[model samples]
Each structure stands twice: as C-alpha cells, then as structure tokens.
Target: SANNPWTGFQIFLSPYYANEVAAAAKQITDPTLSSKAASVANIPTFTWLDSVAKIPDLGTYLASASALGKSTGTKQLVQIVIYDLPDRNCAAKASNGEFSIANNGQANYENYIDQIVAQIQQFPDVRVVAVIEPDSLANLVTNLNVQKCANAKTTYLASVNYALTNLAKVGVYMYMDAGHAGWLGWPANLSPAAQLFTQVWQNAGKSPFIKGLATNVANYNALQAASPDPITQGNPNYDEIHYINALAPLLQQAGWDATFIVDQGRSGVQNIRQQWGDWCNIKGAGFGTRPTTNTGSQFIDSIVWVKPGGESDGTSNSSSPRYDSTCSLPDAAQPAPEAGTWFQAYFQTLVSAANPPL
Candidate 1:
C-alpha cells in the first residue's frame, strides 16, 4: 500500500481546529457542516488556538516561526489580527444606496481599536505583518461621500495610532492601507491620504503608523495591470504603480522611511481582471511574496496575505447573486462565504463544543 502523501499536513494542528472537528462531527446530519469539518481536519493547519479555544497569543506562532525557521518546511506566517472587535461593531453590511460608512459605525471602529491595543499588550513577542481592516475603509471611498470619507479616515487613523503606539512599545511593526493601488487611484486624493498616514504616526507619538504601506490585501496582480484610464486617458495612467510609486517620493521627502507591501494571498499565475467582481477558483497561486530569511525592499517590505483563502466576501454573504448592501450575515441559502460567516462557524464549533474547550 502506498503511504498517503498528505500525512505531513496533519501534523500542524493546534487544539482549536481539533475541537472544531469534534463539534462538527457531532452534527452528523449536515453535509455542508461535515464537509467543512473534514476540510478543516484535513488541511495543513497553522494557528495558535489553545485547549480553552481562545486565540493563543500570536507570539506563539512568531516563536514557532522563529524557532522552526526553514526547518518547519512551511511558510512561517504569524498573524496580528487587529479587529478583535465584538459583534455589531464591524458590520459586514454595506450602507444603503452607496458604499459609504454604515449608519452606526463608531462602535465597530472602537472595538477594533481596543482589540489591537489589547492584543499587542498581551502578546508582546508576536511579530506580524498587520493587515489593518479587510474592507472597512476601502468601502468608504468607493461607496460614500467625501465628508464620510474624511470621517472614516479620521476614525481609522485614531485606531491605527492606538495600535501602533501600543504595539511599537512592545516592538511590533505595523502597516497602513494604501488601498488596492487601483482603488486609491480612482479618486487620486493623495493629499488626504498623506494626512491619514501622518495622523497615524502622530497618534502613535511617532512619525508614521506603519513601517510602510500595504496594498491589494485580497486583490490580484501588480497595480500596473489593474490601473484604469485616468480622466485624461492620454497620460497619467491611474495605475497602482503610479499612485503607490508617486507616493514613495513624497513619503521620502517628508523624512519618512516609508515602504510598501501587497497581499498576494490568492495571486500567482492567476491575476484579477479589472472589474468589481472578479473572483473564482484560482490555481498556481500560493504565497505572493517570496519566502526568505530577509524581506528585501528599500521602499517595500515583504508582501503578505492578510486575507485567507476559502473565506468569502459579500457575494457569498447573501442570496442576492452578487454583493448586497443590506445583507449582513451570509445567506442561509448559501453555506459559507460571508466575511465572518465561515470564521464564526469555524470558531463556534471548536470553542463551544461539549468536549475539550467547549
């Protein structure tokens, strides 16, 4: 008999995923639930979940990565989840009519702020590449008014400051959003953006909030391919390159040693087409940035995947065929695609089970 080649994948489990598997098995009747369980059990797992089901400190993974180095034979990725926020705080729902801030957005923002500071304080040993907010701020510019945009920037900058100041005190590096270079280029409001970064630093009692900028957290391709025709189409292509690159000089001139990073989580041979909804199954996509001992970039640090694969965005969230502003929880009609839907289920099964952590 041939030995199963995937055996190596099973060795990395932390107790949380294991508890999730046990709880899921108890459901017995849910094909979707069972399949989800099996997949979790089968995948090459990496997390810091403890017997208690609480997210084991991010420091544990950092220590594992540091200690294992290349010996682990896997990407030594560590997560610094900023939004340890509570429910109703970070609504996955879009606002009515436009892609602006939700009606009651403050609580969520504050929750995330608290989460960041708390995590940094509790786990000082963790080293992470911060992916600030998945789609929170981006939705503001693409969906809201200028005033709302400014307001969102103000609120988020405050959170960034709180996190950076507290995290840096413990030596954790941070990054600020540049938006997908394409999105930032849509409005081309570099001045406002500069203000946001500046304020983040000021809030941190430092010069800037992050070591550099992070772009295309879940988007695909280099900013060049995703660039659109500017209002004057003839020159100044509003490519991510132009925007991110343009800001590079400005960031430098300001006595800031800013750099950049991109989220290549689901990008490799496959790149996203220039459109609003351009995702499906992709292949040849593994880690975006090269894995190495040193992250080599003068103005850019190593790219990381803040978004995990198999997680769904709004499209998967509801029954509406596409993204719906009104829909919050992932539609029951659909199994798993909502932003926190899968994670919620994933964690619940593990943490609330009858055995172990439950």
Candidate 2:
C-alpha cells in the first residue's frame, strides 16, 4: 500500500476553517489548552461539498489560478468530501440535505459531479482524494425500510457508479463511504454492507474504481476500544479497527481489493456506553490522532479528519430547521449550534478532552 504514491498523505487547509480558528482563538483563554486549541485551527481538513447553496460553483473555485497555484506550489494532496447524495442521511434528521428522489435528484447529482470532474481535469498533476457520498450507501442498507430510501436505491447506485467511473478517469482517488463501526460492525450488517460495496464497484466497472473504504466519516467512534463483552472470551474484536479487519476479507471475497481510512477528528474520547449507535455531536467528544499515513495497521491506509471538529452536527434547541432527539438528550452538551457553524465552546471541549493530549 505504501507503494501507491498517493498514499503519502498531504492534508488541505480550507479558508473556511482558517477563519474559524481565528474566531475561536480570541474566545478560548485557558492557558493550559490555549496553544493546543490554536494549533488545531491551523491543522488541515477536508473541504466539504454538499448543498448547492454551500458549493454553488466549486468547479470554478477549483480551477481558479489561486487554487491551482497553491496546489502546485505545495504539491498539496487535496482532500474533499462529497456528501450530497439524494435523500442523504435518510435515517437521521440532523445533517439531512436538500436533494431527494422525488425532486429529480439523480439528474441534479450527476450534473453536480460533471462540473466537479471538469474542474478536477484542470489540474492533472494535483492529487485529489475524494471521500464520496458519505452516508449514502450506508443508509441504503441500514435504513432500507424508509419509503424514500426504498424508492431511491436504484437512483443512488446509478449516481455512485457515475461518480466512480468519471472521477476514476480523472485520476481521482475515491474512497467509498462505509459508515462507522457502530452501524456496520455488527454481525448482521457487515457482510451485506461488503456485498453492497462490491455490487456498486462491479456496476461502476470494478477494481481501482474505488481506492478503498472510508470509515467513521463524521461520527465519533474510537478507532480501537475494548469490547463490551468479556475479555475471557479471547482477544476482543471491537472498535473501528476490529470492524475494518472483519469487513476487509468479506469485501475481498466479493471482489473489492479495498484499503481503509478512518475519521479520527472526534474519536479520541468515547462517550456512548452500550449504545455505540449515537451519531449526534456527542458531549465530551475530543480530537483523535492527527492525520498521518503512519497507521501501524497494514489494513488502514491513513487516519484523517474527514469531519472537522467544532462544526456543529446539529442544534439541540429546536431552533434549526433540522432536529433530532439525540441532540437534546439529558447528557447532551449545551449551547448546541446549528449544523456547519462553529461552536467555540465545543472546540475548547474537544481540545481539552483529547485522550492522547493532542
């Protein structure tokens, strides 16, 4: 895997996050954690691609001389998150997007990708690792019964196929979303999830169509944790590391020579007990290991901050358009900010609570 030139990780800094750091630097003054918090603001993170309102003309942005020049000078490996699949987050209320099958969503999604590919083509030498359509495929298997999800399955596959085929041609490294350990790590969903990925890759022309699987995209789940069950049962197989190990062989059997990457941005601190299924911006969650290709595991390509910490998962107070019961639970963190907005207090908490101490 290290032989793959692209596997030499390089993180990207989004202007949005740079300003976020500037804003929070002034508000947080605890001497003990001030410098660490400031350091986080400087660390690189993936630039998100979502609703039309958020990224109306990202192609133009990508093709700009400024972007091309920066990427050229630094030889930066740009990491981008593609999360606009139709009826995305079907199982959850928070972070739900604008597109759906009822609204000619497939056409809209394809058009979006067409423009993105065109921009990517402009920079032939600059490496691009796109985390494709997080939560899209995972939801198809996890929330299959939802009316819109059942109706949109075919469209979803077609859109993903289109993305893989076109982006692969541009030399873009695509990592298909594999949800998180809590969602697909169970005995029931693991094989089916692997099978779904194989089917999608096969339909998209297979092999190299996807670079690998990206786990824990935005959720906070420790990469490795002691299983809730007895240690006396033998070595524990819990956490994302164990989850990936179990799924990799299943994926290989189904014809996916896949590698794995994890979102460690908010996984350093574990908050949920028996219910590992929690997805909201959980309280006391902290920053995990920084992005690096030096993952001691052969199965994992890298650890990445796919989801930038401090960005609110969703608001708890019912003021935002989206609402979820998990966000307002008795143990939920206070002053819940709306999705995508900066939460200064939350940033402080994550930095201070960091397990490996940032």
Candidate 3:
C-alpha cells in the first residue's frame, strides 16, 4: 500500500511548463492544433533540475505551485529532476555537465546535492519526487567501453552514493535513472545493470524514501512499441514497459524498492533513429503519454514527462566541444539548440505529433 508516494495528490502542473506551453500555443496557427496545444498546459509534467544554475528556479517554482495547490484543493505533489553530476553523462558529449571529476568535481557535486536538499526541505508541504541523474549510472552499465565512461567509473559510484545519501534525508521519493530497454534490456546488459543498480541502492543505505528507477528520460523509447524494432532485435526490452518488467524484479529480489516511473515526453514518435541508440533531439519525436498512475504494470509508478519537450537534447554543430555525433544523425532535429534551451520548432512538432491525441 505504501509503494506509491503520489497516492492522493495530483502531480503539480507547474505554471512554468504550462506557461511555456500556453505561450507556445498562442503562436500556433491551426485551430485544432492550437487548441490542443493550449489544452496540454492542463496536464502535469516534471521539471528538470539538470543543472546547478537551475537550483534557484526550484525555489521560485515550488512557491507558486504550493499556493496553487492550496487554492485548487488538489494537494499538489511535484517531481523535480536531480542531475548535474561531475563529468555527467560520461557516455555522451551532448549534455556533459558543468563540473568534471578531473577538476575536483566531487566537492562541487556534493555541493549541488546539498543545495537541492535545501530547496526540497523548504517545501515539505509540496511532496517532492526526484528523478536522479539520468545517464550517470546507465553509462557504467553499457558505455564503459567509452573512454570517458571508463575513466568515470569510481566517480559515478561515489557521485550516485553521494546523491542518494543526501537526497534520502530530505524525505523525497527518489527514482534513479534506469536506461530504457534499448540500452539495458538485453540479457547481458540487463543482469549487470540490475547488479549495479541494486549495489548502488545498498550503498545508499536502502531508504524507503529512495523509491525506485526512472526510464527513457530525453530519449524516444515508447511505453509500448506498436511493433518489434529490428534495430534492437535480440534485446527483449523493446520498450520502456518491457524494460521495467524485466529489471524491477531483479532489484526487488536483491531487496530494494523496485517501483518505477517512465518518461513518455518525447516518445510519441518512435523508430526514427537508424540505430536504437541514437538519442539526441530525435527528429520525428512527439509527446507520448501524459503523467498518470494508470501505468498498466503494477511495477511502474507513473508515465511522466521527465524530459521537458522542446528543449534541445544538444547542439547539431559538429564543431562545438559539447557536440555529439548522435545529435548530427539524420534522425535528430537539425540546427538544434543546446541541451536545455527551448526550441520552438521542435515543440511545435511535438504538439502536432502528440499521442493519446494530445
């Protein structure tokens, strides 16, 4: 019964995202799509606390959301992302973080977690659920072959441990990132990932407040793929749901809470990439399921917008130091902005292509 922390409260629909949607909608010309865009603001979406720079915004956003919750009588609950690890996203260059493990990024990383803990503690009335460091641990699972990921091995473990240790004290629900089926769903990848994830939970002291895993952040994996992806053949986790079913039990058996939340924010369109791993502002991507506890699987907590739509996954420029080849792939949106900046064209495409009919 206590498995879900979001039991009675509505996931807070931050005016931050709503206002962005609302403003985005005003420029939309087609009546049907325009109204659809306007209507989307009503649904709840998770905010990305992906950077240290975004920390202060958390305070401002929560205050507005708490007042709105009081007035609207919905008992507002909020989900904020917990990212910004040192040498973050070691597997890819698109979203490399502000702090690097080499430059003594550990102290800065710990400082980042403490500030997040401080902000969350201030809003005890507004229940907080954190989707921690999307690609950090996942890189350790499969991309360790990449030099940066290999170099980051100890730092990632120490960083994840540091994050869980501090975040647990704030009394928030924590769902550490579990890469989607496409990445970790294969038999070889699955078992090792489960071992790593379970080991990390044990490292965190296994607090009940550290709820579970999150999947598909900023990627275009479906909640359920309509058909098998030939690109991911031999990998049984064809979609996020399948990944959860296979991975959750392994953690549970290892004696950790295995509940999950999935990202459907940019998955309305799937199979656009040449390979299943090409994740960076996917070109034909669209919004998928809205936030809902109605996830068909009992293991899943909700299907959520963990990745805010319209924010470019990374730059398309091949020359930029932060550029990743994945962003330049034919399947990725071209001339895209940096990791978190809003891209109006991309957002419009997401609106037009949204599933569950927007």
Candidate 4:
C-alpha cells in the first residue's frame, strides 16, 4: 500500500479555469490534441466556498481531476474542497449573539456531502481526499468579535459536523483546518484555538463526520523547511506546524481522536534565511512538508499539497479576483496569472498564451 498521507493534491480550480479549458478545447484544431487538452483543462476547479450553495457538476469535476493522472498511468491523489457557506452579514446579523449561519455554512454543507457521495459512487476505487475548508472556522476566533467569534465557532462546528455526517456515508476521509499551529499558539495562544475547535464541536453536538484535523491550512509556506544536511537538525521553516503540534495534546484532551494533516504546499525549496515575512505577498517560498513515506510517529497521515501547487495564495495579479481586494496595496503589481508567474506583467507578453495551469 502507498504509505505516507497519500499525497492528495488540492486545487481551487475556479469555474474560470474550467471555462478557459472549455474555450480552448472548442478552438482546438486537432481532435486528439483537443481531447488530451480538454481532459486536463475541462476539469472545473472549485473553491471550498460556502456561498455557492449547490455544486452543479462536482462529481464531474472531481472525476476529471482524478482521471487526469489515471489515464496517464500516474498514481495521483485528488482532493476536494468542502468550504463553509459564507454568512454575508456575519457579526451584525448574529441572532442571540451568535454568528448568522448562511447557506454556505450549514445548509449547503450538507449538500456538499451529498455531492461527495455521488462522486464516490462514480469512482469507487479512486484515491481522493477532502480539504474541508481553509480557515473557515479558525478565522472566526482570531478575526471576529468575542461574541461574534463564539457564534462563528458554533456555526463552524455545525458545518463540519454536518459534513462528517454526510461524507461518512460515502467513506471519504476529511481533513479539517488547524489554521497553522503558529496562529493558535504564540502571537495568539495555544489553547485558545484548541478550545475554539472544542467549543465548535460541543456546540454542534458532535458527530463522526470528521476524520482528522489539518494544520498550516496555507501556512506551511510560512513555516516548515527541510535542512540541507540532515545533520544540522535545528532547521525550522515557518512557525505554524510546530505551534499546532504543541497544541495536539490539548486537541486530544478536547474529545477528538482524529488524525492530523498538514499543508506543505510551498515549502519544497525553502529559503530559511527569510523569516516568513508578515502574512501577505510572500511568494516563491517553495513547497513545505515533504511527501515521503517517513512522516512523524505522532503524525497519522501524509503531508499533502492541500493548497494545490499553482493557485495564488492571495498574491496579486493572479486569476483570484479576491486578490484584487485582498492584496494589501491597490497599486501592487499584478503578476502574470500563471504558476510561478513573475511579479511583472512583462512576463505575460513573453509567454503569449503559454501561462502554466494552477
């Protein structure tokens, strides 16, 4: 059996990515070339978004991504994103001091599970994993008001619990968010985030829907690196993984016995000298978490590229529209929207329809 946490590749294949593939396929001059390109591009990439309540062709998309490697005799793992439905009003719309649950949170999460089951039915032996959501619940505690945060946690638990319930029926293994131990630890506090998960689970009345907890949602880029000489072992990449690892005992104390998964999306070629610059605009950091058979003893699963290889992690000029607003600076240069595209739009002119897919 393939050991290690089974390198499940996660992608936020936007509807745009799929559409682009479709458009290109339509214009393909050769049928054979079109089929090959369509197989790779037609697969719809989806965000684990809570707002898009219904997944029209989720199974189709998932199958397509999985089929990509299979058809090529490649043993690849595919991950599906099950995001919480966003409750737009957030704090202000809270009823009883709790965050307002939206279609993306609880109502639609159930539907997401339904879609997962359908996917499983279509591809029984496929190796697919799920990155439930990115900071969906974790952010509630760190980013919202006290009462609002509490409500957000409550709603989060409900969403995941519901997902577990629905996904369990289909035998899918789900990796929940740990928000990179660093955020939950120092600069914050360890137990606080741990407690938040406990709080969410308790509030939602617990279910076996969850399989394991994941950390470093998108932080491995900010933490975890491989040492050049295995001898000089004190090499620390970013601050999140170890921070979460510290709180593992507390998480176990909170009544959850799930495995822990980490996101090593961009820590491969680590630049240890750079101390993981403040949150935004940190690109080219290399992939974190080596995909090996030798994961830690306490670690239950593999280090997955949960954040997919090429999607912009909130950087500027990427296809991510959210980047337009999320970018710290309005004048920030938009990088060519291709995998590892340089910060200058100049790169696009040179590529000429040769941008890499995320």
Candidate 5:
C-alpha cells in the first residue's frame, strides 16, 4: 500500500532545519547572505539520526512535521538519515560513530533502532523516507582492505540485516545507501557492489518497504554534469545520472528492483574538488538540486538534499581523532566545525552559491 511513498506527497520541510536556518540567518549581517539564508529555510532537507543521543529528538521533530503535513492538503513526506551504524564510516575518520562492534556496539545499535521505530510510529500521519546507514554497506563493497572495514564485515551485514528487518515492519519506506559514482560507480566495482547489496536485501526477507538505493549522501556529485569531472575522466558513471542508470539495472537483474534517491545538496559548484573523493566541507561547493521527484530517469525516485547543507562534514582539527584530512584539503573550507555541527559561514556560502538561485 505504501508503494513509492513520494508520489503526490509534498516533501516536508522539517522545523528542525527551518529554525536552524532562521538562527543562522540572524547571525549574518550582509543583506545578500541574510536573505538567501532565510530562503534556504524553506527548502526541504533530511533530518539526520547520526547518533544515539539524537534518537529522542525524533518524536518532537516528527510531531511538528506531522502537523505541517495536516496543514497542507497533500500528504507530506519527511526524509531522515538512519546513520550511526556500529563502527560506521569505517573507511574514514570523519563522521565515525560512537560505537564499535568490538565493544557491544552491535547490541547498542539494536536499542538505537528500537527507540527510533517507537518514536516514529507515534506520528502515523507523517510519511517517512529513511536513508539508511550511509558508508556502512558501501565500505563492505570496496574498503574492506582498510582494517577497520575488514573488522566491520560481519558486524555491518548483521547490523544492516537487523535494521532492514525491523525498520521494514515499522511501515516507513527505506533506501539503502549506495556510494556515489566516484566510489562504487567505477566499472570494476559495480557488479560486486550489486551482488552484495541484493544479497543483503534478501537477508532482510526482501520487504517491499525497503524501497531502493540512495546515492551521494554527504558528498559532492552532480546530478547530471554535462561533462565528467576533470579528475574522473573516461569513467562512464561520471555523475549521479549515469551512476543510477548503470547500477539500478544491475540490482534489478540480480533480483532486487532498485529505485534511487540522489543527493545534489552540495553539488551546485563542481570541478572544485581536486579529486572526486575530496569530500568534507568542499570549499567552492554550493547547494544544487532541491528535493523533488523531477529526476529525468524513471528509476530515480527523487533528487534530494540528503545531507543538510549547513552541517560540517568533519572537524578541521588535526589533533581530534575525527579530523579527516579531506576537510583540510586545498579545496576544503577551513576553520570548520565538527561533523554535524552547524557551519554558519558555510551555510551563508551555500545559500549565496545555490545553483538555481534560491
């Protein structure tokens, strides 16, 4: 009954972000920036549940989202990131989770999932589109050589299997994270990634509520760049468009009929990163496509602001364990805050630099 939950549903612009952008706008004195920042508050962005501490806030946010839905004639849908897997972001230090599989992280993650479900189920009227555990399954595909990913192997599979099985029963639509074209879209990585993803789908009993794949979370990749990035030349899956077309059919052929959600939130300005992999507060990046089902491809369900644009991708402090070198790269914005914290200057930058002119 919940097939393609986005159909006819107005994507809910959560108050969580509305208030954030409002406060961020006030801090800005420039007329150009303050106005654009105010406008960005109206755009829909995903609410991230990236830690156990954030779980309880769900009910409060959902209640507001549900009320907003009722005020509008069309049913409203909210996109939420179900991040925080045990040892998540195993291949990278930035955005790493608080739990580690070696230390009851798996057990703690189960509690995390249970609480999230219990909270979301309270607001029956609010439709939820869950972007599940970014960087977890994707690492299993290619980053296993990194010892942390290698160690997370069984844990990642088990954690995701448990997530899908339980979350599917809660009735929200779910999308497993598929890494961007620059990562998994390389010709060599596509088939193995597909095989692994579908097997994981089957492992969860193939629930129809497990909608499909989500790509480009918290990373900069164009929805449809006219030409490949200078660094990613000769690769056919050069952008999100090609990535979805190439990967979706493979997943379907492997027995999972995959649809996709692409993130263009920070892709407005491309050719900025020295390498496609140079993520984490990319300097010249700006907001790209807004959340809409206007994707030209039939298989792509929507192009959304999966990563809330104002949040820092990682800490700039080299002394901190979570500091990622990418955040300090030549193209990365400096003096950034920790991952998930609001980067005020960056917010102003995103608004002023939005491709379609907010």
Candidate 6:
C-alpha cells in the first residue's frame, strides 16, 4: 500500500535545542520577553548530528535520543543528519569534513556508516530518518571541476552507493541531500541531478534504499512561495514547492519513486535577491515553517528543519584551515562564527523577522 512510514510516529526534539533555549531564557532579564521568545523558539523540530569527530560516540548519541523519545510517551521519530563523507562540501571551504582521499577517506566512510548502522540496529523500536551525507552527492554532480572536487568524484559515488545499500539493510528511512532549488532548479541541472540519483540507487543494488530527497539543507530558500514578488514569483526555480513538482516527475521517469522533505529552518524571509548561489549565513533570514507531514503534496513527506537556523554556516572572514568567499560577503550577517556553533544574535534576529510570527 505504499503508506507513509512516518505517519504515526512522534517527532523527537534534541536536548540541544532545549539547552539553547534554556540558556537564552536565563539571559533575558525581562520575564515577558523571555517567555515569549522561549515559547516561539522552541516550536520547530531540528535534525541532530552524527558528524564524525564532532560526536565522539554515535551509539551514545542514538541511545540518548531513544531515551528521550521513550520519555515522550509516543513512538520515537528521530531526524539525524549524517555528515563527514570524505571531501564533503567540496564547493565551500567552511564545514569541510575530516575525510579526504589521500587519507583513506573511502574506507573511513564505510567504517563511519558501519558504526551509525550498528547503533540503529540496536534500537529496532526507534523510527530513524537519516538525512544521508548532505552535499556529498549533489556537489559531486554540480561542482565536478571545483578544487579537490574532481578527485572526490569516484570516492563520493562509491561512498554514497555503499551508504545507500548498507543503510537500507537496517531498515532506516534514508533521504539523500538534493541541493536546494537555487542550485538544481535550472532546467539544465534538474535532469542530470535526477539521473545521478537514479544511477546511484541502481548502483546500490536497486533496493528501496532512498525514501526521498531533502532540499534546502542548511540554506535560506523559501519553501511555500517565493518572495520579492515580480522577480521571484511564478519562476519555477524560485520556490522550493515549485522546484519539487518540476523535479519529482523527472525522478519518477528515471525510475526512482522518491518522496521529499525540506529544510525550512531559515527560509522565512520578506525579500530576496540573486546571490549567485551564495549560501552562507544571510541577513534577515528567519525560521520558516515547522516540521510537518501535512505538506499537501503527495510527493513530499514533510517540511523539516534539517538545519537548525542559528548555527553558523562558516566563518565570515577567516584565513586559516579553510576560507570561503561567500562567508565574507557584505550582505552576509556580520560577526559570523565557525560552522555549527550557536549564534544567539542570529537566532534572535530570526525570531524577530519571522514572517508569520514564529
């Protein structure tokens, strides 16, 4: 019957979000403002990370999530973002992972997945939706000629195929990262992206390994409708919803019956301008729609905050281990922190700028 596997489960929220809000609550001296901020800020669902070297033990993290889920008195549904593929995020300098081909990245990737799958297998009762290796596949196809990227191509494909096949065996619902509409929405990029995904699925032994595609992971892109009316409205590539409708049929035609979920964590914006694919932390971006299964699109399983809105995408102006030009753009929010750290000021801005009042 192809029913949505995610329908009955209770979505899980991490102590990470809880802890952040609690800290903010303590700092804001005004009771009313604190209460109001806490109430709205805590409403969205965010994906937890199992990034390599970031979390020392994957098993412990899963155990913690499972324990929290059990306390909720409903079926546990945890959203996990799997980063740390070798040469990850090739298009950008910030958030580059610890894996590289010269350092045996492929083998290391297999071991990484093995450890994560081991944890998933340990908890049969838990419903796990794994957002597998964001930017790994999409970058492989989209930024083939970028620095260190061409070298990453073979390894990336091999690693993703391995992940898709291996993760499927443990019954985990997998959502591969399909870079946001801004990257793949063009007519030229859409079909190739779908074809690449289909080829990878076949390479993974044609299992029902991939449940869907995830868009806007950690990027500020409108999901429901495009803004700045006359420029973005009616443009198929401008909105996430329109982009999915246009891409879904192509994927189906290519022999992949995929559903979708989107990262709307920071897409709530009043206006937008072309940035030439600049995806660093942008100003005026606020929390978008909350995670939900009632997307009204049969092809889209849910709207998710795969990327927590306040985390820094990269350092704005740094010259060290890594430096991305986009991070230093004039329009980018100033005082940007390193990737994945909490940004309290940015968080506050997002809450204030929320279009529909978070």
TM-scores, all candidates, are 0.58, 0.90, 0.95, 0.62, 0.96, 0.91
Q: Global lDDT of each model? A: 0.45, 0.76, 0.83, 0.49, 0.85, 0.75
Q: How would you encode candidate 5's per-residue C-alpha lDDT over 223-247 as one tens digit per residue?
A: 8998778978768888988888888
Instruction: Give me the runs in candidate 5 sitting further than 4 Å from their true place.
Output: none
Structure candidate 2, residue pairs in collision: none
Off by over 4 Å in 2: 2-9, 54-74, 207-209, 226-237, 271-274
Off by over 4 Å in 1: 1-77, 84-126, 136-154, 207-209, 223-242, 269-297, 315-336, 340-358
Residues 1-358 of candidate 4 have per-residue lDDT tens digits of: 1233354433324454445545555565657655644553423222343333335555555566567656666554445666544342233222111123643445555555666567666765455567776656666756666565565666566666676556666656666776664455553456676777776556444555455677665453433433332321343313444654666678678777556666665444344223332333334444344443345636456555454333443454434533433334432224424322223222121112221222
Judged by TM-score relative to the true structure, which candidate is superior, 3 or 4?
Answer: 3
Cα lDDT tens digits, model 2, 263-303, are: 99987876543345556677888888888777767788888
Query: Among all windows of ten consecutive residues in candidate 4, which has the lowest summed lDDT?
Result: 346-355
Q: What is the lDDT of residue 253 in candidate 1?
A: 65
| lDDT per residue as tens, model 6, 1-358 | 1756578886666666767766765666667656755865456465555466534444655677678777876777677788877878776766557777789989998988887787778877787788888887888667888876787889888988888888898887888888877778766788889888888877887677578788988877777673433334434577778779888998888677789988887878835444636677788787777777878687888888888777778777676466677877866887787777777777777777766675
Determine which window of 10 residues in candidate 1 has minimal summed lDDT: 1-10
lDDT of model 3 at position 23? 86
Q: Give the top-scoring candidate (lDDT).
A: 5
| Tens digits of lDDT, candidate 3, 207-285 | 8888888998877888888897677787777888888888888888898758998989888777777888888888877
Ranking by lDDT: 5, 3, 2, 6, 4, 1
Cα RMSD of predicted structure 4:
8.3
Cα error, residue 45 of model 5, in Å, equals 0.7
